[PDB]
Paper text:
Catalytic cycling of the PRODH reaction was performed in crystallo by soaking crystals of the C844S variant of SmPutA in 40 mM L-proline, 1 mM Coenzyme Q1, and 1 mM NAD+. Surprisingly, the structure determined after 24 h of catalytic cycling (1.88 Å resolution) showed strong electron density evidence for a species covalently bound to the N5 of the FAD. Based on a recent quantum mechanics-molecular mechanics study of the PRODH reaction, we have modeled this species as L-proline bonded to reduced FAD. The covalent adduct links the N5 of the FAD to C5 of L-proline. The N5-C5 bond length refined to 1.66 Å, which is rather long for an N-C bond but consistent with the aforementioned quantum mechanics-molecular mechanics study. The FAD exhibits strong butterfly bending of the isoalloxazine with a bend angle of ∼20° (si face convex). Altogether, the active site in the adduct structure is partially disassembled compared to the Michaelis complex. As noted in the previous section, the covalent FADH−-proline adduct was modeled only in chain B. In chain A, electron density for the adduct was weak; however, two electron density features consistent with either proline or P5C bound noncovalently in the PRODH active site were observed. One of these features is consistent with a proline-like molecule bound noncovalently next to the si-face of the reduced FAD and was interpreted as representing a newly produced P5C molecule (occupancy of 0.73). The other site appears to be a heretofore uncharacterized secondary binding site and was interpreted as either proline entering the active site or P5C leaving (occupancy of 0.87).
The bifunctional enzyme proline utilization A (PutA) catalyzes the two-step oxidation of L-proline to L-glutamate using proline dehydrogenase (PRODH) and L-glutamate-γ-semialdehyde dehydrogenase (GSALDH) domains. The two active sites are 42 Å apart and connected by a buried tunnel that is hypothesized to channel the intermediates Δ1-pyrroline-5-carboxylate (P5C) and/or L-glutamate-γ-semialdehyde (GSAL). The PRODH active site is located in a (βα)8 barrel, while the GSALDH module features Rossmann NAD+-binding and catalytic domains, which are both characteristic of the ALDH superfamily. Kinetic and conventional X-ray crystallography of PutA from Sinorhizobium meliloti (SmPutA) were used to capture high resolution (1.47–1.88 Å) structures of states along the catalytic cycle, including a novel FADH−-proline covalent adduct in the PRODH site, the intermediate P5C bound noncovalently in the reduced PRODH active site, the covalent acyl-enzyme intermediate of the GSALDH reaction, and noncovalent complexes of GSAL and the final product L-glutamate in the GSALDH active site.
Author numbering: 14 to 78, 83 to 134, 137 to 1229
The structure:
């Protein structure tokens, strides 16, 4: 039985001094990086003057010599230009040239273009919008574009369509690519090869999602090498053409986590392509991609350069990105490698293409700093400093200076001096964009320096997958190509020397002022939790030791009563991935000691309530600091006790830290002397987020002034015990927080105890219903229901239309459905695929499924761990077999035999016919797939809502009309657009749903603390200027009936309601996170008096709800002659169970009436109802007898605004 963590993440090879220096610079502060770059990039005054002169001459040439022309000729608006190009694109998808021309002449030009063209004409409008306008919009206003296309055709007819088609054909066949196939691209290269250029061809493959895709990219590269080599005809690697490849195209799991697979499976494929390039003697360049693939790619480069089968050939090339903080250390490593191997490595120096994405990734991951510079001028200095390094080593490497910036060019041209020969170094540029500049460089009559054109090769479909990334660059306010076209920009500004500008700044190397470090994402509110970089070798080495150490500890969990540990029954705690791995020991709580603990908490409550809220929050902040410091050890316990992967365990500890700091800040913002605690609160938590959810409930209750009885899930008591220990170390007194391990019997004894003033439950809907029933028996000393927060299961869907990008969808589906083996309340359960793209996406999804590694989670390479118990396994596998027994297609990955020592379920895809085939939440790694026709979208949303759950929901579409439609009709608490659906970042995506998924309020949001005090505070930003209009009509009706006091109360409720609140929450770049208050639905009213009914109706209507009024009240005569607007919202119910589901209830009566009604409500089928009760006299005395916070519904929506391939705002 293998030792825990003994193979966690061993590096591919022992790290040399040169490799360790690369790693040390990964996230070095920007003020530390620049000074040595400024020193390295310094040149003489004479050189600087000469370079400015050269740059000035180049830039004057460029300024003194397409779509814009079309737009001008026909006076097109921007939307008209974009729609015309979308139309042209579609028409070109028609292959038969004369067939197309006829469709245009006889059908399109005579209007009704909708009539003739299961896929929006405008799916790529974001890209064409960049071409026409220079600005990137994440989503497509398809109704605007359809109106514009109708308008321009009705105005200008076939001629404008003809010009649109020809324009599109030219840009897509000749400007964005050198050719559609390698043979065509080579034909078109002859002309500029004559003029002294050379070429490197890029076959536009990247991001293989399946083994099939990788093998297809491999054979594309192989066939291109043959065509290029045959065309090269012996010209060699400097004069003749080469090829560029992306390693991500050649393997579907190209990542540090899968390093062993990369070296075993990807390396041989690159070697075979390199052997072919060697035979023809052409270049083969490895392109640079994301920052977390840099160091892994060095391991491939090293093996290849030391492989004797490749000796005698100097065509191997490697890209280095000067916007990266590691660039100079990467170059030292490469130059040394070229010395040891004897290979003259071709080094392409670029600035870097993924800047937007790197900023967002570091912010999302809570890392210490960015792996790239944040000021564009720093990249320019880095570039020039690294060019100086390369030019001093031309004996050993072949520098290739890829840039379109004339200032950069001129600086390097003069840096290189007067001695030149072909083969010493070259410049490089991108096809289409750089020929203007470099035609001022190449040739004996210019600067007589060679330039290699990077030449994309691909069909229209292929080009558009990543044409945005390639444009977005030349289009930002900071880009040279953009600035030289701006007339407001002078030549003097363009020939400005970045080295000298940086040197003379006050602070050399300061971070950009408008980009937040990950720790500062929330500004003064609170400190963001910090993560761990699992691509950093130093981090992996350190984490390996801490994880090993955490596994030698003798973890225990005991009943920790206010007076001290209690004895009880003791059993071991086993690793769910391997029951031979004993993780610890738990002593469970007796039912008598459970009851004892509640009495002890009651007696302690005044002492804890009297601790000022700000000192209570200081305890939470201290606890957050201790967990941050203990994160590596906590990680190791979560991995082995709960079966979680390291990545998921990091995110869990972050969430615990975030809960603690968020509820501390909310407390400091809100709580004062009049917000009295409820009293002892019982917190019952689930196994599957055994630290974060556990901590959030307890931290909220404590900071609100309540002593807590913490009852963790029976499966995961050890991490709960550690969280309690940390909370007590931080200053929470033993009497304020008692730990009671055990099963549901401990939970139920706690709920039933008379001094229990409130319950916070997270778990299954079934168990929540049992707790609701127990509590219907009970009232508070004041005669009011015991507050219950119950956050329960989900049946979460994602809808995907034909505009979505399949590779993005598959990544988000694999993550959402099979991360944590699907053991997240938010996990994706039903994937809904538009019929037109269903087969393609499903094929890709099954391919990606078979790349997942299932096993014990103490290895970094494991993607999917075990399920928590053999009972959970049996329940999940029974579901799979029923489905398989109804004829449903079932796809499963094969499990390795090593899984036999634990409880594993293989990730599973099930193809359903209708959504009605699923009855209950299946809490496991099981994805169901259904298909829909686009016209039935609205019915599909109904089917999703019809399950009665309402937790998470995803939508993948580029089309605004679809977004508006679906998000206005779906009923769920957490929405996600063009991303995964498992985001629950505290204070950013406040988490929690409706219906069968919860009562609210949401955890990690601003209404949560108010449920745990007797008088609710006003949350930050909690108000609305909007007044419900049916409420206003009802207040007027009351005035007409003579109920003047109730009329005024109604108008007051109208004003106090926060319905219509609509906020954007601060978060990472490249995302919009929105928070809104909606109506809950239909509220059950159980009045006793006429005035009580009017107050209840006012509260419900003020918050946007409809109502069902208890007919047994006998108060029908009190609502004669209602305005139709109000009557539409009102119904009367004899049989409550028949008229649901309800979303809440308002009750009037004395204590025995409230208790009776409460039992009746708890017996209603379906969701748990948040009930509010008041006596007639309380309604008279207290205008907040019915609190409006609990009559609205919170909705969180997280939109990935980077999904179109770039970040506009950045
Ligand atoms: C032949 C060839 C081959 C390649 C590439 C280019 C060329 C010409 N690229 C793309 C390259 O990284 C770069 O994005 C473009 O060439 C534009 O940079 P220029 O120097 O031409 O212009 P320019 O001087 O305008 O520099 C713009 C660049 O500055 C950087 N930048 C912008 N804002 C910034 C900020 N706030 N802070 C820091 N830096 C900022 C970015 O790197 C951006 O591309 C690349 N890229 C890649 O990553 N891998 C590869 O393999 C290649 N391959
Ligand atoms: N909505 C959310 O925020 C959220 C988050 C995590 C998990 N969940 C849900 O939790 C479920 C999985 O967790 P679980 O298996 O640990 O849940 P569960 O319902 O099995 O058990 C949850 C807790 O209730 C206790 N319990 C069991 N019976 C009880 C009873 N009769 N009286 C009082 N307490 C009792 C258990 O000891 C445990 O602490 C899933 O349905 C999941 O969707 C929801
Ligand atoms: O594909 C890209 O964006 C960059 C430019 C050429 C190679 N890599
Ligand atoms: O992916 C694309 O379309 C761009 C075009 C040049 C290289 N990459
Ligand atoms: Mg259970």
């Amino acid at each position: 039985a293998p030792a825990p963590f003994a193979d966690f993440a061993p590096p591919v090879r022992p790290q040399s001094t040169l490799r360790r220096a690369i790693t040390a610079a990964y996230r070095r502060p920007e003020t530390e990086c620049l000074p040595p770059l400024v020193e390295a990039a310094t040149q003489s005054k004479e050189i600087r003057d000469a370079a400015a002169s050269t740059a000035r001459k180049l830039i004057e040439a460029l300024r003194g010599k397409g779509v814009e022309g079309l737009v001008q000729e026909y006076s097109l608006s921007s939307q008209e230009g974009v729609a015309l190009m979308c139309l042209a694109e579609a028409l070109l998808r028609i292959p038969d040239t004369a067939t197309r021309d006829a469709l245009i002449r006889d059908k399109i030009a005579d209007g009704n273009w909708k009539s003739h063209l299961s896929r929006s004409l405008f799916v790529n409008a974001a890209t064409w919008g960049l071409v026409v306008t220079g600005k990137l919009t994440s989503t497509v206003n398809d109704r605007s574009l359809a109106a514009a296309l109708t308008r321009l055709i009705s105005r200008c007819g076939e001629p404008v369509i003809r010009r649109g088609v020809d324009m599109a054909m030219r840009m897509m066949g000749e400007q964005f690519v050198t050719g559609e196939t390698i043979r065509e691209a080579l034909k078109r290269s002859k002309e500029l090869e004559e003029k002294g250029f050379s070429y490197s061809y890029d076959m536009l493959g990247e991001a293989a999602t399946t083994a099939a895709d990788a093998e297809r990219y491999y054979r594309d590269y192989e066939s291109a090498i043959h065509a290029i080599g045959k065309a090269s005809a012996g010209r060699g690697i400097y004069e003749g053409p080469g090829i560029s490849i992306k390693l991500s195209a050649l393997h579907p799991r190209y990542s540090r986590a899968q390093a062993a697979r990369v070296m075993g499976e990807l390396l041989p494929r690159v070697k075979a392509l390199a052997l072919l390039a060697k035979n023809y003697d052409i270049g083969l360049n490895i392109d640079a991609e994301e920052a977390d693939r840099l160091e892994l790619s060095l391991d491939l480069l090293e093996v290849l350069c030391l492989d004797g089968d490749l000796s005698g050939w100097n065509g191997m090339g490697f890209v280095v990105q000067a916007y990266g903080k590691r660039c100079p250390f990467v170059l030292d490593f490469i130059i040394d490698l070229a010395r040891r191997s004897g290979r003259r490595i071709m080094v392409r120096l670029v600035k870097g293409a993924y800047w937007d994405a790197e900023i967002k990734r570091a912010q999302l991951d809570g890392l210490a700093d960015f792996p790239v510079f944040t000021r564009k001028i720093h990249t320019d200095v880095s570039y020039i400093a690294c060019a100086a390094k390369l030019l001093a080593a031309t004996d050993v490497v072949f520098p290739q200076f890829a840039t379109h910036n004339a200032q950069t060019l001129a600086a390097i041209y003069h840096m290189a001096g007067k001695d030149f020969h072909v083969g010493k170094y070259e410049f490089q540029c991108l096809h289409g964009m750089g020929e203007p500049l470099y035609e001022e460089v190449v040739g004996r009559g210019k600067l007589d320096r060679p330039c290699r054109i990077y030449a994309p090769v691909g069909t229209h479909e292929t080009l558009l997958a990543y044409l945005v990334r390639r444009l977005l660059e030349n289009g930002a306010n900071s880009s040279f190509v953009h600035r030289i076209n701006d007339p407001k920009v002078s030549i003097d500004e363009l020939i400005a020397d970045p080295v000298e500008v940086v040197r003379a700044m006050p602070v050399v190397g300061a971070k950009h002022d408008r980009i937040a470090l990950p720790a500062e994402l929330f500004g003064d509110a609170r400190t963001n939790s910090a993560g761990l970089d699992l691509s950093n070798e130093e981090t992996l080495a350190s984490l390996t030791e801490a994880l090993r150490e955490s596994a030698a500890m003798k973890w225990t969990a005991l009943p920790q009563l206010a007076t001290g540990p209690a004895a009880g029954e003791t059993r071991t705690v086993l690793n769910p991935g391997d029951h031979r791995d004993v993780v610890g020991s738990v002593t469970e709580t007796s039912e008598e000691d459970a009851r004892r603990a509640v009495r002890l908490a009651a007696d302690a409550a005044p002492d804890w309530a009297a601790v000022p809220p700000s000192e209570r929050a200081a305890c939470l902040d201290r606890a957050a600091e201790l967990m941050q410091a203990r994160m590596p050890t906590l990680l190791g316990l979560i991995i082995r006790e709960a079966g979680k992967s390291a990545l998921n365990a990091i995110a869990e500890v972050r969430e615990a830290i975030d809960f603690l700091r968020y509820y501390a800040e909310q407390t400091r913002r809100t709580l004062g002397p009049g917000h009295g605690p409820l009293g002892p609160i019982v917190c019952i938590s689930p196994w599957n987020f055994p630290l974060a959810i556990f901590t959030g409930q307890i931290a909220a209750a404590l900071v609100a002034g309540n002593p807590v009885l913490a009852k963790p899930a029976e499966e995961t008591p050890l991490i709960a015990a550690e969280g309690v220990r940390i909370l007590r170390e931080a200053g929470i007194p033993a009497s304020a927080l008692q730990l009671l391990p055990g099963d549901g019997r401990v939970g139920a004894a706690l709920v039933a105890a008379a001094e229990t003033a409130g319950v916070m439950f997270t778990g299954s809907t079934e168990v929540a219903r049992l707790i609701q029933a127990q509590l219907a028996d009970r009232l508070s000393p004041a005669g009011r229901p015991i507050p219950l927060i119950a956050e329960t299961g989900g049946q979460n869907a994602m809808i995907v239309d034909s505009s979505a990008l399949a590779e993005q969808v598959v990544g988000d589906v694999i993550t959402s459905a099979f991360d944590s083996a699907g053991q997240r309340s938010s996990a994706l359960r039903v994937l809904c695929l538009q019929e037109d793209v269903a087969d393609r996406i499903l094929t890709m999804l099954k391919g990606a499924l078979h790349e997942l590694h299932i096993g014990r989670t103490d290895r970094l390479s494991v993607d999917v761990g075990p399920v928590i118990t053999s009972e959970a396994k049996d329940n999940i596998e029974k579901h799979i077999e029923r489905m398989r027994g109804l004829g449903r297609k079932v796809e499963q990955i094969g499990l390795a035999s090593e899984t036999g020592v634990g409880t594993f379920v293989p990730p599973t895809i099930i193809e359903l016919e209708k959504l009605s085939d699923l009855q209950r939440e299946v809490f496991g790694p099981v994805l169901h797939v259904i298909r829909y026709r686009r016209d039935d979208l609205d019915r599909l949303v109904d089917d999703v809502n019809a399950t009665g759950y309402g937790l998470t929901f995803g939508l993948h579409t580029r089309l605004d009309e679809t977004i508006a439609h679906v998000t206005s009709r779906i009923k769920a608490g957490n929405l996600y657009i063009n991303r995964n659906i498992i985001g629950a970042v505290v204070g950013v995506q406040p988490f929690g749903g409706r219906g069968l998924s919860g009562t609210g309020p949401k955890a990690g949001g601003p209404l949560y603390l108010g449920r745990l005090v007797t008088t609710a505070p006003v949350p930050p930003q909690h108000s609305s200027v909007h007044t419900d209009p049916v409420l206003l009509d009802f207040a007027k009706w009351l005035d007409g009936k003579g109920a003047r006091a109730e009329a005024e109360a109604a108008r007051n409720a109208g004003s106090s309601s926060a319905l219509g609140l609509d906020l954007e929450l601060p978060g990472p770049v490249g995302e919009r996170n929105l928070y809104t208050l909606h109506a809950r639905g239909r509220i059950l009213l159980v009045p006793a008096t006429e005035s009580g009914l009017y107050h209840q109706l006012a509260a419900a209507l003020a918050t946007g709800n409809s109502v069902a009024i208890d007919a047994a009240s006998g108060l029908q005569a009190s609502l004669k002659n209602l305005p139709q607007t109000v009557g539409l919202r009102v119904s009367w119910s004899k049989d409550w169970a028949a008229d649901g589901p309800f979303a809440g209830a308002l009750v009037e009566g004395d204590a025995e009436r409230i208790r009776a009604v409460n039992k009746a409500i708890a017996a209603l089928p379906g969701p748990l109802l948040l009930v509010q009760a008041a006596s007639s006299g309380e309604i008279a005395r207290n205008p907040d007898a019915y609190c409006l916070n609990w009559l609205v519904e919170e909705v969180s929506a997280s939109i990935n605004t980077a999904a179109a391939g770039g970040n506009a705002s950045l």
